[PDB]
Amino acid sequence: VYAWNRKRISNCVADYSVLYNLAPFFTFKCYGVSPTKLNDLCFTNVYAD
Amino acid sequence: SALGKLQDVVNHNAQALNTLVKQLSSKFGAISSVLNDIFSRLDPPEAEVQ
Amino acid sequence: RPTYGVGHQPYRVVVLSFELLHAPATVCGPKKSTNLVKNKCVNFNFNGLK
Amino acid sequence: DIVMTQTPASVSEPVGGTVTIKCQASESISNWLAWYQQKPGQPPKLLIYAAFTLASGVPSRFKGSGSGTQFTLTINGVECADAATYYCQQTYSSRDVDNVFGGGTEVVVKG
């Protein structure tokens, strides 16, 4: 946690329908956007930690 | 300046209409002034209040 | 300590940060694309702008 | 996918000094790290694992420092008994990796 990684995501298509088997028992509680319609969105810069 | 009154009437109407149409871009304290943007940015429960 | 509850268990947390602007888009959703039609009343969606 | 280099190639310093070794990564490997020492005609032995924790039976003179990309292995005092080669292991991701271990660094102690 102290040495958290940082990843850049760009020049690719992002899909959330696959994020079930890889991380079972997940919890996507989050802020600033409705998760229900993340399918129809575009992102300028995505960072994964 | 002889025809000031009719010109004043026309200018008054034009500028009132222009102010009305321009005020549509006011934020009114929202995150965005475009309701489409609000719909694709938030879950409904806060979308109603925005 | 796996004997105790989930509060003493390893949790893997992944945090995503966006910017969410519709113009310099490079990471978009998995929805397909359709050919455009001109001179017709249509409900479009350009890079998330509906 | 993960490639490292180990520097310096060799060090030399009298008995009272401190010898330090750099292990740098192409991309960050977090704490995941291990330091190994082999005497000539002897298999390597683990000295520092997780880049900070001392191994078992190892004297408290070898210090590992740094996290993420840059890591340093520092010895407070030499006794002409640590003159050997040291390696650093990624121990983080070895899916398609040419060598988990890094380059060789031989320590020379002139007493």
Curated annotation (Swiss-Prot), chain A:
Q: How does it assemble?
A: Binds to host ACE2. RBD also interacts with the N-linked glycan on 'Asn-90' of ACE2. Cleavage of S generates a polybasic C-terminal sequence on S1 that binds to host Neuropilin-1 (NRP1) and Neuropilin-2 (NRP2) receptors. Interacts with host integrin alpha-5/beta-1 (ITGA5:ITGB1) and with ACE2 in complex with integrin alpha-5/beta-1 (ITGA5:ITGB1). May interact via cytoplasmic c-terminus with M protein. May interact (via N-terminus) with host bilirubin and biliverdin, thereby preventing antibody binding to the SARS-CoV-2 spike NTD via an allosteric mechanism.
Q: What does this protein do?
A: Attaches the virion to the cell membrane by interacting with host receptor, initiating the infection. The major receptor is host ACE2. When S2/S2' has been cleaved, binding to the receptor triggers direct fusion at the cell membrane. When S2/S2' has not been cleaved, binding to the receptor results in internalization of the virus by endocytosis using host TFRC and GRM2 and leading to fusion of the virion membrane with the host endosomal membrane. Alternatively, may use NRP1/NRP2 and integrin as entry receptors.
Q: What is this protein called?
A: Spike protein S1
What is the species listed in this Swiss-Prot or TrEMBL entry? Severe acute respiratory syndrome coronavirus 2
Full protein: residues contained: 350 to 398 of 1273
